[PDB]
């Protein structure tokens, strides 16, 4: 029965190790991702949460009938 239907304990042992490594890395990635989102939303210095401002190319830099702009 063991020879025909099953494998040795090493396969399950090392598959468990691989699965555990993947799961732990995903957990730490999720925690880091939440922290990064919080910091970016608080400070606004990252690529995320970049809310639009007025484009400066719309300004007209020509004389304006009056010296004082």
């Amino acid at each position: 029965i063991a020879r025909t239907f099953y494998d040795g304990p090493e396969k399950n042992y090392e598959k468990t190790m691989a699965i555990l490594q993947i799961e732990a890395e995903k957990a730490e990635l999720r925690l880091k991702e939440l922290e990064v989102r919080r910091l970016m939303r608080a400070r606004g210095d990252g690529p995320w949460y970049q809310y639009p401002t007025i484009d400066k190319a719309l300004i007209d830099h020509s004389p304006k009938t009056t010296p004082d702009n």
């Binding site: 004389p63 010296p67 004082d68 702009n69």
Partner: protein, 57 residues
């Protein structure tokens, strides 16, 4: 915010041109022909400095 600096009344004094607008309009073409250089210098100062206090002379 700071104190706004203003010229004294003494250096704002000048010999005024005391002719009415019709006289000025009658003379205007020759006036713009003859007095072009100082007028243009003043108006360049005016649109560059953007400050009346910097173009008094």
């Amino acid at each position: 915010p700071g104190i706004v600096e203003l010229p004294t009344l003494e250096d704002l004094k000048v010999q005024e041109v005391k002719v009415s607008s019709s006289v000025l309009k009658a003379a205007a073409h020759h006036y713009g022909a003859q007095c072009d250089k100082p007028n243009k210098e003043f108006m360049l100062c005016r649109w560059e400095e953007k400050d009346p206090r910097r173009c008094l002379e």
